[PDB]
Nucleic acid binder design. Structure first.
Ligand SMILES: [Mg+2]
Ligand SMILES: [Zn+2]
Lengths: 83, 52, 263, 104, 39, 1111, 14, 94, 221
DNA sequence: TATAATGGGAGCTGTCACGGATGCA
DNA sequence: TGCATCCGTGAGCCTAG
């Protein structure tokens, strides 16, 4: 099934995205009837919510990377080797 | 560098009996060529009084 | 229901809509208690339904509820939510922000690609809390409060505060943006160079990606605050780091009219 | 706990009443002489919250020592005035009325 | 923009939309932007 | 200096009074000069005669009268009053039963008066009523878009004066009349009009296939009363079909001259189109009890004949300027006056039932508040009532001469397609095809042509000279577009000897179509090329060499010129710059011949022939709507003899009576180290040195002190916790003294407001105890100077309550206005522009010793980039530069007419006369050719610009005739490797200045509901990081920067407080939190009965309100 | 469709 | 252009990972007052005020330079969070 | 119509008046019903208008006074050819009315304005969006208050534990309440005079530290 | 608190294109 | 099942105002 960009954007899973795009009342009525849950998968969702978007420095792929200097590195190494 | 006119409060003024505004009077005072003969001298205050 | 400078009151249309609803509902309750006939009770019930409709989505059904002596439809909750002026598009997908400025831009050909010219007085406000902290570090003020009261007046500003602002903005970058922002290159990060005057100095090579020229354009400035935001702006958004267009891969930071002409 | 999802659903009358801190019975807004909110109106402090932080309407309780107390003379809880941005009211319709979204 | 493999986490959708939209104001014996929208 | 003027064309007539479109309009509308009995049924008189008499008791209208203004124009502008005249109306109340008559003159409030220049003073602010173009009322025929061989006939009255009526021939064959969004068979209405089948068949049977569909046997069977009742049932279902009700409704729909009104234009157009005569401005009449048709049968006959194909019936071009008319100030004000009068009449009729019917007077019967408010509404909040654009005098002139397609009764922006915005052929000589805004308003806002004038029916007429035989008469005929479509009209430049056409073939127009035609076919001829363009466009010399897109930019930007303290008329004028000043009333002129008695900086006294001694005061340093100093200077001397129409005082932006919008600067066209890159402009510091492009501006600050529920706001010098350093320049009463310099943060007016009731925090209790000082009752609320503003205090107006002649709005004790002036010099970021569309920002101000300079030491003033020229196609500025070089050396100015200006041969001749002065002075002073000049000549003859082998002087002359000269780089002394165009160009400093634009904020005011920063420099607001900005940040992947914009910068209250605290303490900014606007969204959705719940990954609720909204 | 018209019709039946 | 930005991008599988590393290290430096730096005194970034060459206050500049030196180890799941924080505050107290 | 209440609202209130009239009507008087009906219907309509037509509701007698003021001003303007002053309006109102009273009555009669009033002829800007929020503290204000708390605690550390506690209790830094000297004496087991004395000496040491360090003066605004 | 009084009134005007529901042959 | 026809909804960004 092929739809245009407008209908495809309106038909997405995120009711926040759809209702902030267009046909706000239609989207909100159908979503509230269905009891829809927005999982906050896309950008517009987390932008509305003020959350850190899931791209770039917000991508889970790079989010949790740590930095540590070799001094503290060896220190904690011997520390966790002392038990 | 500086001009005081009696009974004139600011540059955007106008003296009665004078055709010029203070802006134009100052623009004319910008052309005054004042030669100091004494090289040690560094500030003069010319005084002008006129009527009629 | 707020008082304004002149002691006058401004109120939302939702209050008048709610008042319509309260009045019609109380009159319906009293009409029912007094055993009013069915024609009257029916009229009151249909008016109550219309009042609820006007509160929730005014203009949806029937004529829009207006204010007395006005053609302006009252702003209902549906109107508040939806539209280009609606809640989502106007205040959730985009906001007015602190630590931002706006000024007329100027050609500034002496800058290196990673630089821009930020006027002193703009940076004074754009970095005001950093400058307060640095004026406390250096001896220029006993505390933040005294430093701020010292900056408040424009004749109380001495040269040490300018050198302190220089120490403050060292290495930091600011975001320049020119509307309309048509692609990600409509915002770029530059190391600012404090200059006298009141004009922003753009670099020549970025004018093309900005669609900027110098017939009266203006650009907005934003100060990334956190170390994380500064890292983002310097690594990912620095002008000299975006030379090829993401749309075609070809360089879009390339020589322009005067440069091409001389060469 | 951190937010992960956002659910939107229809509201029961019981849930609408559970949101509400009081019924707006009068259509008045504020008094024409005192400029204070009119009781049981659209800006009632007893319903929606104190206009000023930790200060009930009449002024018997005016500090943080009483947070949660509901003044016996005026009926206003002494908490942060920010709650007047948050606390819902309600109106009890005599005849039920259709939500025009689900109609039109 | 870098002539190298794209880094994981790039907002590729937004980049695509902006890349397609930016020259729209330039689209003119030609069907042009109405054709682009019809597609 | 000498003023050489080119141009063979001699104009048989001068330009009409340029503001007459406003002046005559309002004068005819008011009829204040006509004695009442001799007034005509127009304007206010027509409105009164339309509203009266008022029946059921009878109240009739005798006459009206206007009084004298209670306060003159200057006092109105001073005290924020409306310049207006008192309106009285003599009304006699009659009892049709008794015969009693009680006649009284009731006072219906005030009506705003138009000033001398065609503007208005509404609440002290100058405003202009912009003319409105719209489709003329009448009867039109336009093709049905569905069926090609069918046509819709439209009947269109004045706006708000009746419904449109559409006649269509349906596919089923019957003719349908469509009114008020409802269709029915026209046959029923014809039967109501008294038409019978015999007359209809004998009147329309010539068209075979249509009268059959017209025939309806049942409708012909039923009587006129039955058909009227049936039509009422068809038009208003549910309403009981009472016979008197149906009579009233159909009458007020089709025949009531009070409820249905064609224009006078509409009546004439219907007559001219259908070959009929109208009794009045209605479609039918009510005579002797029955309806008598006047419009419907003619329109139906025309529609049938058009559908058939009968010769003599055409479709109508609805964008023809004979079908689009101009509603001027008089007509718009009259419409609003009629509506206010109708509301007053409703009140009168309602009171003619209440009260005691035995004892009543017109003074008791009339309440004027409807009319008062309906006039105030128009003048104060109409879209066509605009804040007057009085930057310079040409701004006001052009503003008054503008035509809007927008506004009440017209198109909204979405309803504008291409047909309206298009330049129609009939715009020739009526609407300027150049002067129009860029952007969404293009083709909707336009300007009246120079020679064009609006006739009494509202159509724009343009003049033409009569041509009989081959002789061109001096008699002019002003024609509408409709009448212009009848004649062959030759061009204005067609050659002549005396009054006779010279050429064998002339260029002419038939219905705008261009055609080469013999002198015997010439019926009329153009007056001048000027008549094709607006007043602003006619100020663009060498316009014939400028592409229209950039000519538009120059024409519009002339409006934005700032009056400079040393303004000059351009070296290359077009001829209109004197009439512009005159008709704009900038300058001051002598009434009759006489002799100057006195000359002051404030006034000029003249003794005329009549012996009477007349004194003219001079407006000195007044602030205009846009803060540009309107200021008159005296241009005569004591004892100087003057004639009628001579100049006594120059207005702002006027030099000796010539429009002086900018300055004449020496410009070199060359790149310069990238400082003119992409239209930037380089200027010499010598411009600042001699105060070129230096303008005086004034700003008005205002502060009120009113009564509170906590005590009186007091304007006072006693402000708590402030030093004498901060209070230095305040007088006894707290107001800044006249003449003191004020910087950002300085107090203009001191004010104390009473502190709001609040308990001191325990911190404040302990601090007050530590210091031993009472916390004052009042609070510093003084009016300080905004950031980036300031200057010199030149005026202070103080108004209290209780002092004579003053009454403020209720509650306000006192008002104070401070006026702060400033002498703005040119600086980087200011916008310059020439009359050809070349506009730029000052980017680099170089010291004189760096400027490209002539061999004789003369440095240029402005460096412009040739790269601005080729893609813009505005060579007129190049021609102006050449002629300016010539005139710069010859010491003379020129008047080059539009499309009849200086041509290249004559420009070369003047350039040679100038080169003689340039080079012979040197060769006589004892100097030969420079070595660098020889090198430049070498490279120039390599460029093919001079002939190899001629002398250096001859080659330099060859270059000079091309407008190019040798230029030394002041930084090296080495010459520019090529010859460069240097000359005098007229350049203006536009209104857009960096001191006005530059703004910056760190923290400031937030909005009430959204808790986001406010917007606009005026409110110290933040920049809008909108959707597309968020998109840019997303595509970059700057998640934390985006989250800062979303939370810490604007909406996170907790986070913004904590972030400011962390930055002033030296800590890293804290992790953000929930945006207050998202909380607002949640609560508004709850108000819409929608449960919105934030959830953790276990699907349990998450309270983003932290317990404050849950019991 | 029009509440005033509908109520006027309802009135016009008694 | 930031000095050695090409090598800094070569160090990582994702430029955004590079940015996160730089930002977290700058946070470390600010929180510990630079007493934890991996830069020798001759490698410290300097700025030119009227007094003289002073330590560059830009912790992000510092962190990029340290990353270039390579005495920093970066990656996911290297140490518990509280353990890292407490060991860093034990070595370099606040 | 056009008095603040809609046509249908006026119709419903008039129906209420008609119900009252049906209840109170006395056919014995031989009057047609419409007379008594009309009286009660007019009364109900006018009461409803006065009660509801204002956002800030105003008592009915005050409404009638304001409308008397309105008609007085209108008569004066129709007889003077100009709008009247407060003094002329007070004169025409007669005994007990002065210009101050006329002005205060006019001020009380001022109706509120809409926050969504359009600013500009385009549909982009509302009047409310230019109205700042004065209630919520600014970031600068909140930071100043927290800095004041921190500096006050700094200065209170320069005291002894007990003599800083006496000040914290007597000035509300603890409990939010200001304890009396007898209460602080009962808490520390000393005489009320003893607590007053150690409070005096604690404030003395604080004043000395202040005159020495000048760390709190900037907080006096 | 009483003479009788018994169904409103403004509309509004030069766009357009599409999607989806209703309405007829 | 197929069309006309009606209703509802959307129609660029920032500035100032
Ligand atoms: Mg530009
Ligand atoms: Zn209380």
């Amino acid at each position: 099934l092929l739809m245009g960009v407008t209908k495809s954007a309106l038909s997405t899973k995120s009711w926040l995205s759809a209702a902030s795009f267009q046909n706000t009342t239609h989207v909100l009525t159908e979503a509230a009837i269905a009891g829809k849950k927005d999982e906050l998968i896309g950008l517009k969702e987390n932008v509305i919510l003020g959350r850190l978007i899931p791209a770039g420095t917000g991508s889970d792929f790079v989010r949790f990377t740590q930095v540590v200097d070799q001094k503290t590195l060896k220190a904690i190494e011997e520390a966790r080797k002392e038990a | 560098t500086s001009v005081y006119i009696e009974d004139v409060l600011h540059e955007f003024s106008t003296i009665p009996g004078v055709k010029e505004d203070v802006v134009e009077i100052i623009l004319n005072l910008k052309e005054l060529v004042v030669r100091f003969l004494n090289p040690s001298l560094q500030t003069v205050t010319l005084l002008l009084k006129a009527e009629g | 229901m707020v008082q304004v400078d002149g002691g006058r009151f401004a109120t939302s249309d939702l209050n008048d809509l709610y008042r319509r609803l309260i009045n019609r509902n109380n009159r319906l309750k009293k009409l029912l208690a007094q055993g009013a006939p069915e024609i009257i009770i029916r009229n009151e019930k249909r008016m109550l339904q219309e009042a609820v409709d006007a509160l929730l989505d005014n203009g949806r059904r029937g004529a829009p509820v207006t204010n007395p002596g006005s053609d302006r439809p009252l702003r209902s909750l549906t109107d508040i939510l939806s539209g280009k002026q609606g809640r989502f598009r106007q205040n959730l997908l985009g906001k007015r922000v602190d630590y931002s400025g706006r000024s007329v831009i100027v050609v500034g050909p002496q800058l290196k690609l990673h630089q821009c010219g930020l006027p002193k007085r703009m940076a004074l406000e754009l970095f005001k809390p950093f400058l307060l902290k640095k004026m406390e570090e250096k001896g220029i003020a006993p505390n933040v409060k005294a430093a701020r009261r010292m900056l408040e007046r424009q004749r109380d500003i001495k040269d040490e505060v300018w050198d302190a602002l220089e120490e403050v903005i060292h290495g930091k970058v600011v975001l320049l943006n020119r509307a309309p922002t048509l692609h990600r290159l409509g915002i770029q990060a530059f190391q600012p160079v404090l200059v006298e005057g009141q004009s922003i100095q753009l670099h020549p090579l970025v004018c093309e990606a900005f669609n900027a020229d110098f017939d009266g354009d203006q650009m907005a400035v934003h100060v990334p605050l956190s170390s994380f935001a500064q890292a983002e702006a310097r690594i990912q958004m620095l002008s000299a780091h975006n030379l090829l267009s993401p749309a075609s891969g070809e360089p879009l930071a390339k020589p322009s009219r005067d440069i091409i002409l001389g060469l | 706990k951190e937010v992960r999802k956002v659910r939107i659903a229809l509201a029961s009358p019981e849930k609408i009443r559970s949101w509400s801190y009081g019924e707006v019975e009068k259509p008045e807004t504020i008094n024409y002489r005192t400029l204070k909110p009119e009781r049981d109106g659209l800006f009632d402090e007893r319903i929606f919250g104190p206009i000023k932080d930790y200060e009930c309407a009449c002024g018997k309780y005016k500090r943080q020592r009483f947070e949660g107390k509901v003044c016996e003379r005026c009926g206003v809880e002494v908490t942060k005035s920010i709650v007047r941005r948050y606390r819902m009211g309600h109106i009890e319709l005599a005849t039920p009325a259709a939500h025009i979204w689900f109609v039109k | 923009s870098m002539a190298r493999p794209v880094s994981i986490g790039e907002a590729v959708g937004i980049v695509a939309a902006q890349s397609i939209g930016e020259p729209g104001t330039q689209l003119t014996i030609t069907q042009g932007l109405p054709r682009v929208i019809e597609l | 200096m000498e003023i050489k003027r080119f141009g063979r064309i001699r104009e048989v007539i001068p330009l009409p009074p340029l503001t007459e479109i406003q002046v005559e309009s309002y004068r005819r509308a008011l009829q204040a000069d006509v004695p009442p009995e001799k007034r005509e049924n127009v304007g206010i008189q027509a409105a009164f005669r339309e509203t009266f008499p008022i029946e059921e008791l009878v109240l009739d209208f005798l006459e009206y009268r206007l009084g004298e203004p209670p306060f003159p124009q200057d006092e109105c502008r001073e005290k924020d009053l409306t310049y207006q005249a008192p309106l009285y109306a003599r009304l006699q109340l009659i009892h049709k039963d008794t015969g009693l008559i009680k006649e009284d003159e009731v006072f219906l409030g005030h009506i705003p008066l138009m000033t001398e220049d065609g503007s208005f003073i509404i609440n002290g602010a100058d405003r202009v009523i912009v003319s409105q173009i719209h489709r003329s009322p009448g009867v039109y025929f336009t093709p049905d878009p569905a069926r090609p061989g069918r046509y819709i006939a439209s009947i269109i009255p004045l706006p708000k004066r009746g419904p449109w009526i559409d006649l269509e021939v349906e596919p089923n064959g019957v003719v349908s009349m469509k009114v008020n969004k409802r269709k029915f068979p026209l046959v029923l209405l014809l039967r109501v009009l008294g038409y019978d089948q015999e007359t209809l068949a004998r009147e329309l049977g010539a068209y075979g296939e249509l009268v059959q569909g017209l025939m309806d046997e049942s409708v012909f069977a039923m009587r006129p009363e039955e058909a009227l009742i049936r039509l009422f049932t068809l038009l208003r279902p549910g309403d009981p079909p009472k016979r008197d009700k149906a009579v009233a409704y159909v009458y007020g729909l089709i025949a009531d001259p009070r409820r249905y009104d064609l224009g006078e234009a509409g009546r004439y157009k219907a007559e001219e189109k259908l070959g009929i005569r109208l009794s009045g401005r209605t479609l039918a009449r009510f005579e002797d009890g029955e309806f008598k048709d006047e419009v419907f049968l003619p329109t139906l006959r025309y529609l049938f004949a058009l559908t058939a194909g009968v010769p003599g019936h055409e479709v109508d071009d609805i964008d023809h300027l004979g079908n689009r008319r101009i509603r001027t100030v008089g007509e718009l004000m009259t419409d609003q006056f009629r509506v206010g009068l109708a509301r007053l009449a409703r009140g009168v009729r309602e009171r003619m039932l209440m009260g005691s019917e035995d004892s009543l007077t017109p003074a008791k019967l009339v309440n004027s508040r409807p009319l008062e408010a309906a006039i105030r509404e128009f003048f104060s909040r109409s879209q066509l009532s605009q804040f007057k654009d009085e930057t310079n005098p040409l701004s006001s002139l052009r503003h008054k001469r503008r035509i809007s397609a927008l506004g009440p009764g017209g198109l909204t922006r979405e309803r504008a397609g291409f047909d309206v915005r298009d330049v129609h052929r009939t715009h020739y000589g009526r609407i300027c095809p150049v002067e129009t805004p860029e952007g969404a308003n293009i083709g909707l806002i336009t300007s009246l042509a120079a020679y064009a004038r609006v006739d009494e029916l509202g159509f724009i007429r343009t003049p033409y000279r009569r041509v009989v035989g081959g002789v061109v008469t001096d008699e002019v005929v002003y024609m509408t577009a409709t009448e212009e479509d009848r004649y062959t009209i030759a061009q204005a430049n067609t050659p002549l000897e005396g009054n006779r056409i010279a050429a064998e073939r002339v260029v002419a127009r038939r219905k705008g179509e261009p055609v080469i035609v013999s002198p015997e076919e010439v019926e009329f001829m153009d007056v001048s090329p000027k008549q094709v363009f607006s007043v602003n466009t006619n100020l663009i010399p060498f316009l014939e060499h400028d592409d229209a897109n950039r000519a538009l930019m120059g024409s519009n930007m002339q409006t934005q010129a700032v009056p400079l303290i040393r303004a000059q008329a351009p070296v290359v004028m077009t001829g209109l710059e004197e009439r512009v000043v005159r008709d704009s009333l900038a300058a001051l002129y002598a009434e009759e011949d006489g002799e100057v008695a006195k000359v002051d900086g404030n006034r000029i006294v003249v003794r005329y022939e009549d012996g009477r001694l007349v004194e003219y005061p001079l407006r000195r340093f007044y602030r205009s709507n846009q803060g540009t100093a309107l200021d008159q200077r005296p241009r005569v001397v004591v004892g100087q003899r003057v004639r009628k129409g001579d100049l006594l005082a120059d207005g702002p932006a006027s030099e000796n009576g010539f429009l002086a919008l900018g300055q004449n600067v020496l410009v070199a066209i060359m790149p310069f180290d990238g400082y003119n890159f992409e239209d930037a402009i380089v200027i010499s510091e010598e411009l600042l040195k001699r105060d070129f492009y230096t303008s005086i501006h004034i700003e008005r600050y205002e502060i009120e002190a009113r009564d509170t529920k906590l005590g009186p706001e007091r304007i006072t010098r006693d402000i708590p916790h402030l030093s004498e350093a901060a209070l230095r320049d305040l007088d006894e009463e707290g107001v800044v003294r006249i003449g003191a310099e004020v910087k950002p943060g300085d107090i203009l007016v001191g004010r104390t407001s009473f502190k709001g009731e609040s308990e001191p925090t325990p911190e404040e209790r302990l601090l007050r105890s530590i210091f031993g000082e009472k916390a004052r009752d009042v609070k510093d609320t003084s009016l300080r100077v905004p950031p980036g503003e300031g200057g010199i205090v030149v005026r202070t107006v103080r108004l209290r309550r209780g002092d004579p002649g003053v009454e403020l709005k209720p509650g306000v004790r006192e008002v104070v206005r401070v006026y702060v002036a400033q002498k703005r010099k040119l600086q980087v970021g200011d916008k310059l522009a020439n009359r050809h569309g070349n506009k730029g920002v000052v980017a680099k101000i170089l010291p004189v010793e760096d400027m490209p300079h002539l061999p004789d030491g003369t440095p240029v003033d402005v460096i412009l980039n040739p790269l601005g020229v080729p893609s813009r196609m505005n060579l007129g500025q190049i021609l102006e530069t050449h002629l300016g070089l010539a005139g710069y050396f010859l010491g003379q100015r020129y008047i080059s007419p539009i499309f009849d200006g200086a041509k290249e041969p004559e420009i070369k001749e003047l350039l040679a006369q100038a080169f003689e002065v340039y080079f012979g002075k040197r060769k006589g002073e004892g100097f030969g050719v420079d070595k660098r000049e020889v090198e430049v000549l070498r490279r120039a003859e390599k460029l093919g610009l001079v002939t190899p082998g001629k002398t250096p002087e001859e080659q330099l002359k060859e270059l000079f005739l091309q407008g190019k000269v040798v230029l030394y780089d002041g930084r090296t002394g080495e010459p520019i490797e090529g010859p460069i165009v240097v000359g005098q160009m007229f350049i203006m400093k536009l209104y857009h200045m960096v001191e006005d634009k530059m703004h910056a904020r760190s923290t400031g005011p937030y909005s009430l509901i959204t808790q986001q920063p406010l917007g606009g420099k005026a409110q110290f607001g933040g920049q809008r990081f909108g959707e597309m900005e968020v998109w840019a940040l997303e595509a970059y992947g700057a998640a934390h920067t985006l989250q800062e914009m979303l939370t810490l910068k604007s909406d996170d209250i907790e986070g913004r407080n904590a972030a400011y605290e962390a930055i002033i303490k030296g800590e890293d900014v804290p992790e953000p939190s929930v945006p207050e606007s998202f909380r607002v969204l949640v609560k508004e959705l709850q108000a819409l009965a929608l449960d919105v719940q934030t959830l953790d990954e276990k699907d349990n609720p998450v309270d983003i309100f932290e317990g404050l909204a849950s019991k | 469709s029009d509440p005033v018209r509908q109520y006027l019709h309802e009135i016009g039946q008694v | 252009a930031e000095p050695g930005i090409d090598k800094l991008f070569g160090m990582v599988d994702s430029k955004y990972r590079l940015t996160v590393v730089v930002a977290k290290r700058a946070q470390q430096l600010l929180r510990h007052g630079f007493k934890n730096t991996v830069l020798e005194p001759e490698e410290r970034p300097k700025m030119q005020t009227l007094e003289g060459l002073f330590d560059d206050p830009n912790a992000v500049t510092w962190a990029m330079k340290e990353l270039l030196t390579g005495r920093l180890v970066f990656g996911e799941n290297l140490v518990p969070e509280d353990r890292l924080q407490k060991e860093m505050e034990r070595l370099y107290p606040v | 119509t056009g008095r603040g209440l809609s046509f249908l609202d006026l119709i419903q209130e008039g129906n209420q008046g008609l119900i009252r009239a049906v209840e109170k009507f006395e056919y014995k008087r031989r009057f047609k019903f419409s007379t008594y009906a009309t009286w009660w219907i007019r009364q109900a309509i006018n009461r409803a208008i006065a009660d509801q037509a204002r956002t800030i509701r105003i008592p009915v007698h005050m409404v009638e006074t304001i409308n008397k003021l309105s008609r007085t001003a209108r008569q004066l303007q129709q007889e003077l050819g100009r709008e009247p002053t407060y003094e002329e309006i007070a004169e025409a109102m007669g005994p007990g009315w002065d210009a101050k009273r006329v002005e205060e009555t006019l001020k009380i009669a001022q109706e509120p304005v809409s926050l969504e009033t359009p600013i500009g002829d385009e549909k982009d800007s509302f009047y409310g969006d230019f109205i700042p929020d004065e209630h919520l503290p600014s970031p600068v204000d909140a930071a100043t208050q927290s800095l004041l708390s921190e500096e006050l605690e700094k200065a209170l550390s320069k005291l002894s534990e007990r003599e800083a506690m006496v000040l914290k209790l007597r000035k509300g830094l603890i409990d939010g309440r200001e304890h009396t000297l007898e209460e602080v004496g009962a808490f520390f087991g000393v005489t009320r005079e003893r607590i007053r004395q150690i409070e005096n000496k604690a404030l003395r040491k604080l004043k000395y530290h202040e005159s020495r360090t000048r760390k709190l003066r900037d907080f006096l605004d």
